[PDB]
């Protein structure tokens, strides 16, 4: 698990800074990356401290117009991400997953969040959010955007918690299709 998590840290996971602070950003493919919606990125963000113009941005909502707490960004930079869409899996039920963080004080951080489960529709920051993956791990401030994953499987992006549970926005391959 650590070897797969380390591979994501070298080739896909970066630190993205908005006006709301530092967030772990996962590069999906080409110049497309994901970030929690509550980061509220503007026309420009910092990628590992470098000012990068945001070409495209759109918040993800399910077909039932329910918030997904995920925002897909297209960056105007030269480096193309490694295509990790093949690792995105929806078979997460009961998997002992790992959260890969690279933001704030948690740089190059690999956490064992225990077994995950599809919580579904929960009230996240007074906003109903669907496709919620829950793990019984005390995630902390500065870890939003961490990549929930296991060996050869990417499950979602951490979006919040309550000091005892943590929640990740489910990643699906259909999100990156026009
Ligand atoms: C990441 C954001 C951060 O670190 O600062 C940004 C620079 C945090 C991670 C949370 C904080 C506590 N433990 C975590 O894992 N995310 C949030 O703080 C989000 C922001 C949004 C949207 N947030 C804000 C307000 C409430 C909650 N949590 C819940 O509403 C909730 C519901 C249930 C059920 O359990 N928790 C929240 O995540």
């Amino acid at each position: 698990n650590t070897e797969f998590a380390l591979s994501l840290l070298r080739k896909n996971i970066m630190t993205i800074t908005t006006s709301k602070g530092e967030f772990t950003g996962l590069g999906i493919h080409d110049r497309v990356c994901v970030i929690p919606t509550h980061a509220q990125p503007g026309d420009d963000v910092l990628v590992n401290g470098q000012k990068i113009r945001v070409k495209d941005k759109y918040k993800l909502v399910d077909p039932e117009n329910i918030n997904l707490e995920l925002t897909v960004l297209t960056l105007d930079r030269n480096e193309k991400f490694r295509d990790i869409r093949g690792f995105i899996s929806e078979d997460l039920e009961g998997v002992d997953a790992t959260l890969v963080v690279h933001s704030n004080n948690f740089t190059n951080t690999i956490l064992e969040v225990g077994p995950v489960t599809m919580a579904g529709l929960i009230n996240l920051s007074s906003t109903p959010t669907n496709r919620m993956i829950r793990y019984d791990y005390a995630t902390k401030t500065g870890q939003c955007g961490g990549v929930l994953c296991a060996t050869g499987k990417i499950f979602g992006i951490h979006v919040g918690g309550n000091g005892r549970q943590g929640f990740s926005a489910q990643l699906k391959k259909q999100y990156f299709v026009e």
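The pocket of XNV is lined by residues 20-22, 38, 122-125, 139-144, 160-163, 165-166 (CB under 6 Å). The radius of gyration is 15 Å.
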